[PDB]
């Protein structure tokens, strides 16, 4: 017999290991594959698809068809925020459960550029100009158009083109961010405002809803596979 010497790790079971093993069903006539539509090769592909954001997670709206609707109105111009949101894709309650947030929670680290698209579900007769902002961490989270205007933003003009996309560029100190709330790997602030004001004629609804969607740009990636907290089996 060939002289061999066993090394540390011998006989151990590494749940993540990758070796060969005897087949329990030898010579088994395997049923061939058919060209089935919708085949996926990488989890990131799903993250690149636009998914609706549950923005209004308030006591009464949360866990109902309503949490998805961000309500606007023909009311007078105000430098106050329509909606404030933290750039924590995997940890922030409003992003954590979106297709993107969900896949992110199966991984420990995330990197790259995200893109937020807003859909104006109000009437055709209704005009308006909104200001979508992105403020990289390190300073006072914007509470007024004035401050928000000073950082990465897009002045969305409502018309034929129903929707407007704002790209949140990959701006970070570390090569990767943590899929959890962490001061050190913080992403910054995403806020929305009234550039001018939602204007509507008579015989028309002074109040309308705007839907919001999030998806990952082609420069986006995740690493360090891990078990998620979004599902459990107490018992």
């Amino acid at each position: 017999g060939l002289p061999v010497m066993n090394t540390p790790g011998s006989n151990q079971y590494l749940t993540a290991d990758n070796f060969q093993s005897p087949c329990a069903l030898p010579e088994f006539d395997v049923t061939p594959p058919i060209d089935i539509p919708g085949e996926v090769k990488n989890m990131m592909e799903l993250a690149e698809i636009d998914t609706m954001i549950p923005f209004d997670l308030s006591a009464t709206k949360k866990n109902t068809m309503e949490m998805y609707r961000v309500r606007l109105s023909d009311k007078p111009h105000t430098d106050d925020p329509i909606l404030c949101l933290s750039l924590s894709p995997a940890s922030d309650p409003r992003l954590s459960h979106t297709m993107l947030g969900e896949i992110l929670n199966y991984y420990t680290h995330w990197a790259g550029s995200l893109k937020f698209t807003f859909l104006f579900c109000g009437s055709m007769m209704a005009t308006g100009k909104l200001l979508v902002s992105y403020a990289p961490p390190g300073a006072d989270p914007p509470k007024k158009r004035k401050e928000a205007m000073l950082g990465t933003h897009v002045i969305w003009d409502i018309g034929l083109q129903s929707s407007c996309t704002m790209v949140v560029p990959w701006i970070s100190n570390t090569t990767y961010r943590q899929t959890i709330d962490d001061s050190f790997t913080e992403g910054g602030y995403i806020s929305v405002f009234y550039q001018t004001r939602i204007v509507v004629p008579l015989s028309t609804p002074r109040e309308m809803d705007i839907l919001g969607f999030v998806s990952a740009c082609n420069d986006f990636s995740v690493r360090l596979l891990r078990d998620t907290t979004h599902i459990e089996q107490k018992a």
Binding site: G38, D50, T98, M99, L119, S123, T204, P205, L211
Partner: protein, 268 residues
């Protein structure tokens, strides 16, 4: 086209039926796959198949439903919804096996002064949640298959409590896509949005999807058509507005095997 042509204006023609639209948001082809006949390399049942062509591969218009401030959403299943539609339903019942694609055209017009957004979704193997908390996977064949009139979604989960004589039917909650998952994510599935201010309708071209090359159309429903109000219907000032949602569907490149006597299901 400097010549005139445009994304919003389309003309669809199948067999003796033609659909026109001046206000469309383009059209969607599920998973980028256009409906097709069963290839020899992928075929299973050895008998000469029955291909109805124009007799069945045309446009059937189902019963028009009403959209209101109160509506939580509507649902249909294919082929179930077309089971009673002319020569297509006849050929489906006469054969053991059958496969088919679809051109789903959801029609819903209003006015430049109306508001609202209909989320139109095409879901593969759209398995829905039952009305029982004491038992599972118990929804009866009769209730799981509403036929042409389809079913509807509920804003609230209310469990069937009559243990003695169970309703044995579905309790699809809107925000959970009637199946345990968050609606906000339904968009990973082939779809289109009917935003009153932008478009009259939604056109989805669906391919034959399934773990098998061909299957039992009567026992199994390949596609699920879910229509939910992403943004609630709203008009001028009227407290209780209303607008119709008409659903027209056409079977495609459809074919059938295992011919015998007609299948008379217990649908009630």
């Amino acid at each position: 086209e400097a010549c005139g042509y445009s994304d919003r204006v389309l003309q669809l023609t199948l067999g003796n039926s033609t659909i026109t639209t001046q206000e469309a948001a383009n059209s969607v082809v599920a998973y980028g796959r256009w409906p097709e006949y069963l290839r020899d390399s992928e075929a299973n049942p050895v008998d000469q198949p029955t291909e109805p062509d124009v007799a069945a591969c045309r446009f059937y218009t189902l019963d028009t439903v009403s959209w209101t401030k109160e509506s939580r959403g509507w649902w249909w299943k294919l082929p179930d919804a077309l089971r009673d539609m002319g020569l297509f339903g006849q050929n489906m019942y006469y054969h053991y096996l059958g496969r088919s694609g679809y051109t789903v055209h959801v029609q819903c017009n209003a006015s430049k002064f109306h508001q609202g957004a209909l989320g139109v979704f095409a879901v593969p193997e759209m398995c829905l949640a039952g009305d029982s908390n004491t038992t599972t996977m118990h929804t009866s064949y009769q209730n799981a298959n509403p036929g042409e009139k389809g079913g509807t979604f509920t804003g609230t989960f209310t469990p069937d409590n009559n243990q003695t004589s169970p309703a044995r039917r579905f309790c699809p909650v809107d925000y959970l896509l009637g199946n345990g998952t968050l609606l906000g994510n339904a968009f990973v599935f082939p779809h289109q949005i009917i935003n009153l201010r932008t478009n009259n309708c939604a056109t989805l071209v669906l391919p034959y999807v399934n773990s098998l090359s061909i299957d039992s159309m009567v026992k199994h429903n390949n596609w699920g058509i879910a229509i939910l109000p992403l943004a609630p219907l709203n008009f001028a000032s009227e407290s209780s507005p209303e607008i119709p949602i008409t659903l027209t569907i056409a079977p495609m490149c459809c074919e059938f095997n295992g011919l015998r006597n007609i299948t008379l299901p217990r649908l009630q």
